[PDB]
């Protein structure tokens, strides 16, 4: 996200890794759906399982990679508009034993894939001094 804001036009596939950081015996199922650009973000678990989704049992698999297909980025602006959504719904409940904490956590990662590309270099809008002459 930061190195792309040095460039104007990005294009490529992203990947999202989600990592489950609960206890060893915490079980459950999530459903990570991917919404393509222009489509609307789902609000129900049933609408999410009708799209491109994945049914992730984190009962023993505590990592899921979600490949986001090739976008072309700056081709969808009228100001960047909408590039899609990755949502997550509960499928089951979180099933923990009584000695594990009942609150578990997910962390998510994102990298770009090898077909990612950046062009037309600009300045970063992120940065906008005390103490040589």
């Amino acid at each position: 996200g930061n190195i792309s804001r040095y460039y104007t036009h990005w294009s490529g596939s992203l990947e999202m890794t989600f990592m489950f950081c609960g206890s060893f015996m915490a079980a459950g199922k999530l459903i990570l759906c991917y919404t393509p650009p222009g489509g609307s973000c789902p609000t129900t678990r049933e609408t999410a399982m009708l799209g491109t989704h994945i049914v992730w049992d984190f009962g023993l698999q505590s990592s899921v990679t979600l490949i986001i297909p090739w976008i072309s980025g700056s081709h969808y602006r009228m100001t960047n508009a909408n590039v899609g959504y990755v949502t997550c719904f509960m499928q089951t409940n979180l099933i923990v034993p009584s000695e594990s904490s009942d609150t578990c956590s997910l962390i998510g990662f994102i990298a770009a894939k090898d077909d990612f590309s950046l062009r037309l270099m600009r300045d970063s809008p992120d940065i906008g001094l005390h103490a040589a002459y």
Partner: protein, 215 residues
């Protein structure tokens, strides 16, 4: 377990069950319908008698299968069912995940047949009233004559049954006739020292080798 734009990234991908030793093949119009349809999870408790889903009635209003069912007129499909029941190592209980061909139900203590509303339940499916007789006068004890799997939570948490085309006819009406009934009966009830033990069971039904006629 990756069909279509759907995927089940589970772990313990144990042995599956070809029903009657048969794999679903095409009949010698056909990626859209061949995908997992993960139903809503049911809550298995200590007082659960069982759950059933009739096929393809559990899929006749869902997605690219339920569109084609209500636009076409004949269908021919097998089914891949993946039942997964995620619990801890402190839970116990056995499920009989049995797939029944032509499970004509019967009603209890009346001579009137079951109605349309008692049979065609949809994605919610039903609940066994008398699971010991399988709600049809027979027996649960002999129900392992059907294509079945066991989920002993001590041993395994998932069950996969691969169903072929079970019909006397080459194609069939999806809105009229159900051919398979996925039934999940807890033979040994659920148990851990909390009394409100509530293990979830997840049912994913992928219709394999769907054919259609009469758009």
């Amino acid at each position: 377990l990756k069909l279509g734009n759907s995927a089940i990234v589970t772990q313990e991908a144990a042995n599956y069950c070809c029903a009657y030793g048969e794999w679903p093949n095409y009949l010698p119009t056909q990626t859209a319908t061949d995908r997992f349809y993960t139903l809503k999870s049911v809550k298995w408790e200590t007082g659960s008698t069982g759950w059933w889903w009739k096929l393809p009635d559990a899929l006749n209003n869902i997605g690219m299968f339920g569109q084609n069912v209500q636009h076409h007129y004949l269908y021919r499909s097998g089914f891949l069912i993946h039942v997964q029941c995620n619990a801890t190592k402190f839970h116990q209980g056995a499920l009989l995940v049995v797939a029944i061909p032509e499970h004509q139900r019967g009603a209890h203590n009346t001579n009137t047949s079951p109605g349309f509303d008692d049979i065609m339940k949809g994605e919610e499916g039903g609940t066994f009233n008398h699971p010991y007789v399988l709600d049809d006068g027979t027996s649960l004890a002999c129900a392992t004559i059907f294509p079945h799997q066991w989920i002993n939570l001590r041993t395994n948490n998932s069950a996969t049954i691969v169903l072929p085309w079970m019909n006397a006819a080459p194609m069939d009406f999806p809105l009229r006739h159900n051919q398979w009934t996925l039934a999940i009966i807890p033979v040994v009830p659920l148990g851990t020292r909390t009394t409100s033990s509530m293990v979830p069971i997840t049912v994913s039904i992928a219709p394999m080798c769907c054919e259609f006629n009469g758009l």
